[PDB]
Structure 1
Amino acid sequence: MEQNLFALSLDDTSSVRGSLLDTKFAQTRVLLSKAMAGGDVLLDEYLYDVVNGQDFRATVAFLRTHVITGKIKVTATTNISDNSGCCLMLAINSGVRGKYSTDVYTICSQDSMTWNPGCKKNFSFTFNPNPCGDSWSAEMISRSRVRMTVICVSGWTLS
């Protein structure tokens, strides 16, 4: 049977929502070297380039939803024996300028988690990638050049 196509719910401007499974939109793989130093960039890419080559439940919803009223949760599931420990710091900054400093000092401001894998099994934290409003989008953060940076502030005490 026929129906009027203009009056369907295809202009659904809902935010992304559901369980933590159905809102996941990317996973990222950071490599921590066996012998890493303090002040050592582990990962440093644009927050939109996280989602390149991804196929989770909310990946296409994330890219195509014009407005998102929810925060971004990022959780980091890294662990190590109590014997050792280090200090990682993931951190989101609203932009960049050429040949930038990646000292912990510079970065931490704005939005960051700091954790020691030795003690904390996992660590999660929410944040808003548009710091002066209630909303944002994938297209906003791609063109705004929002920058995610993971840094090791203290090396492995025992490798």
Structure 2
Amino acid sequence: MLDLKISQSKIALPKNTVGGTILRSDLLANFLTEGNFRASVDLQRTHRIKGMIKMVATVGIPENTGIALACAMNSSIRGRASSDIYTICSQDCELWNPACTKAMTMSFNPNPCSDAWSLEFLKRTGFHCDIICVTGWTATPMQDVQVTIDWFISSQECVPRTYCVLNPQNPFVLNRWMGKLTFPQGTSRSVKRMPLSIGGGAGAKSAILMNMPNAVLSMWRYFVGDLVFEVSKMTSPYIKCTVSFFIAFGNLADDTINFEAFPHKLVQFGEIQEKVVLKFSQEEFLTAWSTQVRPATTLLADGCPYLYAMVHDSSVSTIPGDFVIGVKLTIIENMCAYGLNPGISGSRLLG
């Protein structure tokens, strides 16, 4: 490690940070160029590098507070690009809560087309890095905080990740943000409904947000597959809540008593636990469904399935704050798609 260390960045995290807040957004080449460490001139005087870039971020905070940070890598950027968690998280992005995880690691290949990169390549290509706060402090710290990131050239070789549009691989890596779900403290069910007609991007105001893997799925007309979701605790470990997940249609009433007669998954997090991976297999879906539904479509007229999330018991704590979790559809296994999509204009807004 030490010898393969190339740089070190210190990101500032103000005690009053809010969420949606960009901690730092820059050219990856600039994060990789801070400080003179062992492998620094090598990084600069070497024409091809095969090891992946590895980063180690550290910062610890007490259990009676929480905050969700996301560190995202993207091949390029044009203009005043969106910094929304949805847009930035499709390539290589890790989301973490320092209250649960005091040191986070991530290795990635900056050149998905091949197996090597260059620092020049990173500069002239515009490889980008955004570090944003996805959810603010549950309880504010006494003082301002700081996250230190150590950068290394890994011994792990780079491997390509390309997408053949009309010939998806298995599994299909989607990395689509499904939304940020909040369950306010109390005995409320707070039923959440995330549509599975994920084509067309994420809704914005008279606009749409878009990322590459979501754009390739939008090319197809109908699809099915085993869906894998990654659920993250973005709030303090002091706010407890048992969430129930299941597949159902938009037209069921919030007060449907036997919602849990459907196949479901109950999620409770341990103090220090922050992630849970849910997997809904194809046995939950009778047939493929539309990749896109026109945005104006009502819950009553939607013929496509939904990922439901609701409070099983209650959201409780001794400190103020809603229980908040983030849902990300990581991969689709044994996917199956039909036909080409002409396209529908616009899409619904995520959570």
Smaller-chain TM-score range? 0.7 to 0.9
The alpha-carbon deviation at position 52 of structure 1 amounts to 3.6
Aligned with 1:114 (options 95, 98, 101): 95
What is the alpha-carbon distance in structure 2 between the residues aligned to residue 53 and residue 105 of structure 1?
A: 28
What is the alpha-carbon distance in structure 2 between the residues aligned to residue 35 and residue 141 of structure 1?
A: 33
Q: Does 1:49 align with 2:30?
A: yes
The alpha-carbon deviation at position 53 of structure 1 amounts to 4.7
What is the alpha-carbon distance in structure 1 between the residues aligned to residue 60 and residue 97 of structure 2?
A: 9
5+ long unaligned stretches in structure 1: 1-19
Aligned with 1:99 (options 80, 87, 103): 80
Q: Does 1:144 align with 2:125?
A: yes
The alpha-carbon deviation at position 132 of structure 1 amounts to 1.1
Aligned with 1:75 (options 56, 60, 78): 56
Report the residue type matching 2:23 in the other structure.
L
5+ long unaligned stretches in structure 2: 141-351
Q: Deviations over 1:58-99 (max 9, x none)?
A: 000011111111000011011101111110000100111111
Q: Does 1:33 align with 2:20?
A: no
Q: Which residue of 2 aligns with 1:11?
A: none
The alpha-carbon deviation at position 121 of structure 1 amounts to 1.2
Could you state the TM-score of these two structures normalised by the residue count of structure 2?
0.39
The alpha-carbon deviation at position 153 of structure 1 amounts to 0.4
Q: Secondary structure at the match of 1:125?
A: strand
Report the residue type matching 1:37 in the other structure.
V
More strand by share: 2
Report the residue type matching 2:52 in the other structure.
K
What is the alpha-carbon distance in structure 2 between the residues aligned to residue 99 and residue 70 of structure 1?
A: 31
What is the alpha-carbon distance in structure 2 between the residues aligned to residue 108 and residue 88 of structure 1?
A: 12
Q: Secondary structure at the match of 1:25?
A: strand
Could you state the TM-score of these two structures normalised by the residue count of structure 1?
0.86
The alignment yields a C-alpha RMSD, in angstroms, of 0.9
Report the residue type matching 1:94 in the other structure.
S
**Kept after mapping to 1: 8 A contact 2:8/2:34:** no
Aligned with 1:135 (options 112, 116, 125): 116
Aligned with 2:106 (options 89, 107, 125): 125
Report the residue type matching 2:85 in the other structure.
V
Q: Which residue of 2 aligns with 1:15?
A: none
When Rg is computed on C-alpha atoms for both structures, the one with the higher figure is 2
Report the residue type matching 1:67 in the other structure.
R
